[PDB]
Design a protein around this ligand. Structure first.
Ligand SMILES: [Cl-]
Length: 147
């Protein structure tokens, strides 16, 4: 089932994942986007080091300017890789949401509000992920894991 690690966390939030992200693992995040929000992101990291900055296996970056979009990338040795931009974004300012990230053998599958949103192939072994961080303009109601 689901096991939240925090409720109404102050943002930015950086927490350690209680178990290994093996295929089949679900990460659930419920929150709300403020009316003035420009962007926010959910980063799956290897450690919480800030200098040198910890590798980010999966960077999920919803942006709200223009028509909006979702930027996904990977950070290795403080170097970003090739961006994967998703334009059919379900996120909206002043609207609550529920993000579900499925960990599959070769990629992450993200659904928002019960509807598939995007996929992202692993660039870093998922077993190296033990930290989850949330930054930017967003209100988080809960972060949980279904191992
Ligand atoms: Cl797969």
């Amino acid at each position: 089932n689901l096991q939240n690690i925090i409720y109404n966390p102050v943002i930015p939030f950086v927490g350690t994942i209680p178990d290994q992200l093996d295929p089949g693992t679900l990460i659930v995040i419920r929150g709300h986007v403020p009316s003035d929000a420009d962007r926010f992101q959910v980063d799956l990291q290897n450690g919480s080091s800030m200098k040198p900055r910890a590798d980010v296996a999966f960077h999920f970056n919803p942006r709200f300017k223009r028509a909006g979009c979702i930027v996904c990338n990977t950070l290795i040795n403080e170097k970003w890789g090739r961006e994967e931009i998703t334009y059919d974004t379900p996120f909206k300012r002043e609207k609550s949401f529920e993000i579900v990230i499925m960990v599959l053998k070769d990629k992450f599958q993200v659904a928002v509000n019960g509807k598939h949103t995007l996929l992202y192939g692993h660039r870093i072994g998922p077993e190296k992920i033990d930290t989850l961080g949330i930054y930017g303009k967003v209100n988080i109601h809960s972060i949980g894991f279904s191992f």
